[PDB]
């Protein structure tokens, strides 16, 4: 082909993987990838840009985000704003990009019959409207103004702004409606002209593009050739800053800055060369690995023995083509707030022996191996995200390595850790503390999030005093892992296998669920377990008791757990309304024996007072910081108190935590233990006789050390959800003390989850979503969060709006309901060749097969929680689905304005349209339930 | 192709100068290490210099510390003689290291290999 | 710092060890054929390097062992081990002569 400079040689991936591919590099310089997976639902594109936010010119910050944002809404070839995503929607497709100091990444799926008609308009996104111009600088300011109260975004641009201000990396990246708008009107700047300008910096030279699908691998290579061959070539260098933007005067500094949420974090930075070109070593991935180790003789381990941090995180940083950043971020007690200096002290004892030892060839064996075996039987991606993945990484590896380069070391060298090692020296290092104790202390504010803190010099006597940092003996090298698998042996698939998981026991004790893995074939094992019991939910303060129980728990165990946990073998373990969930994933060939050790420390748990103290501060910080979450996550919560028969709220668990005393909890576990219930789950690379060893082996270890009893079935209490009357609707109101945006959810209820049911409200919402989205957010630029979809909850279901905007909900639900009306007359002027379309869409949504085990035993664990038991449900209401007809008419006009049975509840929180009855404010959620009846259970299968 | 050309060799009055030319091929001197390693007349192989471009490191000899000075210019190494007696007459060959980016500045040592040679350049003193 | 020894014979097949005594722990290895320029080895004092014959190992004991099981007619050469070290210092050996007897 002449369109095709060169083509690669071949692609090094895992012996696992089933996927083709191809790359190749095109004439004009786009990095081409290539995948072929005839068995694939949906395929998937993308394409990357290596420039990114840090070349924005000085006087437009943002620039590169707001071309990111104002690419989608049309092109030449194709002017109208949302077909492309109105294609996506009507063809199971969806659409995003990201915008990164040295990236601007698109990405996209659809189903695998339109991987070309989607495709075609993504390349014309790469081959600019007044108005969609004056309304997407709405989208982002209310997109920045949703950043402007996040910890993590005031931290992050305050870091950007405490460097050299003359250097790119202070700008500021987002932009807003001042800098895009108000200040370019003001100087007579013509953002459009600048937008079409800057699309001298698109060139071909510059983008890496990654297609995956069912097509073989020459069907893509013709289509890739056509459809981007023709993109322009200008020959752009690639952006370096050789200048590192951290300066003398900017190092040995003190920065103290105030929070929103009250949170105390410690921050380390040490200012480093770029080692992205060391990428077949990762000095950043060695020095990460041991200092920020968590097993006996680390940091942290000393750290959360003397009482002052809890958790510790070190590494390796991104920076840019010519900086990198090396961090260690940790979290302070009320103790460790006063002993910054002396953590950072023994920081630099760590250091300091990790300088007197020396690199370790066996820690870099250890890693090498360890992560070969992790890459090798790596879960299969979702293609969205992994073609945006690759198309990301291409332009720093080439096109054979690019799928091991940040997965496989090759080549051990020591002079580079030992340089790095150098580098980590208390003449280069920045420290900022983090903390309300600041309030009121501070003389700065940030510009561009008003952020308040204050800058001193650290004094030279503490700076000598970590020059003279002796060793530690608390400090020891990590020991060999006990935990690294060496059986990977696929057990045969029985005769008696299931495609769909079996109840293979069900006694007064327990009830056990077991498939093996007929799918993946890998040697992995997901093991779920849920432990009923009442006193788990009965009060506040047995809740609050539950919850510290399992943070001590797992507080307990981090230390032990985390070679097992850095060894591909992870677990969660979290309280819910019915009692504890525990789930151990991973490889199975040493999962029964950190099981086993699981439940030992369930059956055997010695609280810690100071541990217990400590934790027990720290949650009740977190129910303190629930106060300065966004405002559709308050809306959500408080539409589950509504909703919910039985809920305390984090102002009850707030008050009910101080009465908590340690007498109370060790009286409490044993309690609990006493009479307990158990669903499991095992789904994995184990046998029948494994698994019922395995659940035999629990309920031995849980009888035999904490005596525990089965519980009375009658004693199996499900919660029902508030029924809401006919032609009624409800209005809860309250008022969020953080964030100066407003939120709302309005929320209509149906009547069951039934087949006919579930596949009405899932395709009137398959109708709704696009114009949802384009209606109120690209359009009308209500705000940049706009949501619309279904909601199940306790076997009972409806349909649900979130919208997070300046304006107040009552406008913002007085344009839902007049987008209600407007979608009526739609549907009823829609084509049945649309509807059917509608029907095909949503039956690929549905009938899309899990890529890996975790979201299988996720799919099968929701249907053990709900109790209905439907493991056939895709294929049945699939079947029923595609025998629906334009029944949708009479399903709007029976339960969504004079609907006969309209049930409305709506949830605001503060910061043409038809007329709207008068709403019954809720004064009080217990008097709210006790005035309205409540729906039935499902029933089971 | 990686290969390297030594030119600049010949005959010199003793006391006199003489610069040696390492042309490289094939990649970029910015991104390695150029050693010097002459061998005398009947006699085993002797280090001479050796350069990190990168970090600007240089490394002597004890055998000479004033009278040789080492340089690279950026895609040519140079190896500068400013006084040769009667015993520096020896075959001067240049190399290379087969990792990129090595430290000079080091605790412990790191003997990697210098994969790739030039054919060298004989330099003679005498009248 | 110190090579043994300082010249060895032995027959066509015959396996020869070449003793290097040399801070660095670590030790390279290297063939120069007379007259022509000296060729890569050993590297690492466990790996060899890419094209190398398989009869060539690198070995430690302190002391490093060069080790040659199977000897050919085309390995007449003079081996020298290289020593690295602090302050960017590269050393050699006097080499040692392997003589093939037919």
């Known amino acids: 082909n002449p369109a095709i400079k060169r083509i690669g040689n071949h692609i090094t991936k895992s012996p696992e993987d089933k996927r083709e591919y191809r790359g190749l590099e095109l004439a004009n310089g786009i990095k081409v990838l290539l995948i072929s997976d005839p068995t694939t639902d949906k395929s998937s594109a993308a394409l990357d840009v290596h420039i990114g936010s840090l070349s924005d010119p000085p006087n437009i910050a943002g620039l590169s985000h707001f071309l990111q944002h104002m690419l989608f809404l049309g092109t030449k070839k194709y002017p109208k704003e949302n077909e492309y995503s109105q294609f996506l929607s009507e063809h199971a497709g969806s659409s995003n990009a990201f915008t990164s100091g040295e990236h601007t990444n698109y990405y996209f799926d659809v189903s695998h019959e339109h991987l070309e008609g989607a495709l075609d308009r993504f390349a014309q996104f790469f081959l600019f409207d007044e108005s969609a111009k004056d309304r997407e600088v709405n989208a982002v300011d209310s997109e920045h103004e949703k950043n402007v109260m996040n910890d993590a975004w005031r931290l992050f641009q305050l870091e950007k702004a405490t460097g050299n201000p003359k250097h790119p990396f202070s700008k500021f990246g987002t932009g807003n409606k001042y800098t895009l708008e108000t200040r370019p009107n003001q100087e007579g700047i013509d953002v459009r002209q600048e937008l079409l300008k800057f699309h001298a910096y698109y060139s071909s030279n510059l983008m890496a593009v990654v297609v995956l699908g069912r097509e073989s691998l020459d069907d893509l290579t013709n289509l890739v050739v056509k459809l981007f061959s023709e993109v322009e070539n200008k020959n752009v260098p690639l952006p370096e800053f050789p200048e590192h933007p951290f300066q003398e005067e900017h190092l040995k500094q003190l920065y103290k800055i105030v929070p929103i949420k009250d949170i105390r974090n410690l921050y380390v930075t040490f200012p480093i060369p770029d080692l992205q070109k060391y990428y077949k070593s990762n000095p950043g991935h060695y020095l990460g690995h041991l200092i920020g180790h968590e097993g006996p003789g680390s940091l942290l381990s000393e750290l959360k023995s003397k009482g002052w941090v809890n958790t510790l995180v070190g590494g390796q940083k991104e920076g840019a083509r010519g900086f990198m950043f090396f961090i260690i971020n940790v979290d302070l007690t009320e103790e460790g707030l006063l002993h910054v200096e002396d953590i950072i002290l023994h920081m630099f004892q760590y250091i300091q022996k990790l300088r007197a030892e020396g690199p370790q060839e066996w820690v870099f064996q250890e890693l090498k191996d360890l992560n070969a075996v992790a890459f090798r039987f790596k879960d299969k991606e979702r293609p969205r995200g992994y073609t945006s993945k690759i198309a990301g990484i291409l332009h720093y590896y080439p096109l054979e390595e690019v799928l091991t380069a940040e997965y496989l070391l090759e080549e051990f060298r020591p002079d580079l850790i030992e340089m790095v090692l150098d580098k980590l020296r208390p003449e280069n290092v920045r420290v900022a503390i983090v903390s309300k104790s600041f309030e009121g202390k501070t003389d700065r504010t940030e510009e561009w999030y008003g952020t308040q803190y204050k800058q001193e010099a650290i004094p030279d006597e503490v700076i000598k005093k970590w020059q003279n940092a002796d060793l530690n003996g608390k400090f020891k090298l990590p020991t060999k892992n006990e935990f690294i698998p060496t059986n990977f042996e696929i057990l045969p698939l029985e005769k008696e296998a299931t495609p769909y998981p079996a109840l293979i026991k069900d006694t007064a004790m327990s009830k056990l669920w077991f498939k093996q893995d007929d799918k993946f074939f890998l040697p992995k094992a997901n093991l779920n377990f849920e432990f009923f019991s009442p006193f788990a939910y009965v009060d506040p303060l047995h809740s609050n008791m539950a919850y510290l129980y399992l943070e001590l728990l797992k507080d307990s165990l981090n230390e032990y757990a985390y070679a097992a946990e850095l060894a591909g073998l992870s677990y969660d373990l979290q309280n819910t309304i019915y009692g504890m969930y525990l789930s151990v994933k991973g490889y199975n060939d040493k999962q029964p024996i950190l099981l086993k050790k699981i439940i030992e420390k369930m059956a055997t748990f010695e609280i810690d007072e100071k541990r217990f103290e400590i934790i027990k501060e720290a949650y009740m910080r977190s129910l303190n910081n629930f106060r300065a979450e966004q405002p559709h996550q308050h809306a959500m919560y408080y539409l589950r108190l509504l909703m919910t028969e039985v809920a305390w709220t984090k102002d009850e668990l707030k008050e009910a935590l101080d009465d908590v005393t340690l007498p109370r909890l060790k009286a409490f576990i044993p309690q609990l233990l006493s009479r307990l219930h158990i669903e499991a789950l095992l789904h994995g690379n184990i046998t029948k006789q494994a698994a019922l060893g395995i659940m035999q082996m629990v309920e031995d270890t849980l009888i035999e050390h904490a005596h525990t009893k089965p519980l009375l079935p009658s004693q199996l209490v499900r919660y029902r959800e508030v029924q809401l009357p006919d032609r009624g609707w409800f209005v809860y109101q309250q008022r969020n003390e953080v964030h100066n945006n407003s939120g709302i959810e309005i929320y209509y209820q149906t009547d069951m989850q039934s087949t006919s049911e579930n596949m009405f409200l899932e395709l009137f919402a398959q109708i709704i979503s696009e114009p949802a989205f384009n209606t109120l957010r690209t359009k009308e630029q209500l705000g940049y969060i706009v949501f619309s979809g279904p909601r199940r909850a306790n076997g009972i279901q409806g349909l649900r709006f979130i919208i997070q905007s300046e304006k107040p909900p009552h406008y913002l639900e007085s344009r839902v309901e007049a987008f209600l009306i407007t979608m009526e007359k739609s549907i009823e002027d829609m084509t049945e060749e649309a509807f059917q379309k509608h029907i095909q869409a949503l039956a690929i949504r549905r009938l899309d097969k899990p890529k890996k085990l975790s979201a299988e035993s996720a799919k099968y664990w929701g249907e053990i929680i709900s109790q209905q038991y439907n493991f056939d449900r895709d294929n049945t209401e699939v079947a029923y689905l595609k025998t629906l007809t334009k029944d949708i008419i009479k399903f709007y006009k029976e339960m969504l304005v004079d609907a006969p049975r309209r049930h409305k509840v709506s949830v605001h929180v503060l910061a043409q349209a038809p007329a709207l009855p008068q709403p019954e404010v809720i004064q009080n959620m217990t008097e709210f339930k006790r005035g309205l009846p409540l729906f039935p259970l499902v029933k089971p299968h | 192709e990686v290969q390297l050309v030594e030119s600049g060799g010949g005959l010199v009055q003793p006391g006199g100068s003489l610069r040696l030319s390492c042309a490289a091929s094939?990649?970029?001197?910015?991104?390695?290490?150029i050693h010097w390693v002459r061998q005398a007349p009947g006699k085993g192989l002797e280090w001479v210099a050796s350069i990190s471009s990168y970090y600007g490191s240089t490394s002597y000899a004890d055998s000479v510390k004033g009278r040789f000075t080492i340089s690279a210019d950026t895609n040519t190494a140079y190896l500068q003689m400013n006084s040769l007696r009667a015993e520096d007459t020896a075959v001067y060959y240049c190399?290379?290291?087969?990792?990129?980016?090595?430290?000079?500045?080091?605790?412990?040592?790191?003997?990697?290999?210098?994969?790739?040679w030039g054919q060298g350049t004989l330099v003679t003193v005498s009248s | 710092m110190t090579q043994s020894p300082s010249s060895l014979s032995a027959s066509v097949g015959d396996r020869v060890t070449i003793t290097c005594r040399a801070?660095?722990?670590?030790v390279a290895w290297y063939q120069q054929k007379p007259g022509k320029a000296p060729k890569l080895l050993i590297y690492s004092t466990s790996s060899l390097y890419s094209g190398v014959p398989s009869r060539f190992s690198g070995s430690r004991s302190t002391d490093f062992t060069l080790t040659i099981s199977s000897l050919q007619p085309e390995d007449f050469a003079t081996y020298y081990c290289?020593?690295?070290?602090?302050?960017?210092?590269?050393?050699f050996g006097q080499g040692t002569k392997v003589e093939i007897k037919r």
């Open positions: 801070v660095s722990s670590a």
């Open positions: 190399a290379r290291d087969r990792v990129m980016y090595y430290w000079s500045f080091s605790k412990y040592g790191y003997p990697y290999g210098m994969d790739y």
């Open positions: 094939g990649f970029n001197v910015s991104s390695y290490s």
């Open positions: 290289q020593q690295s070290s602090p302050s960017f210092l590269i050393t």
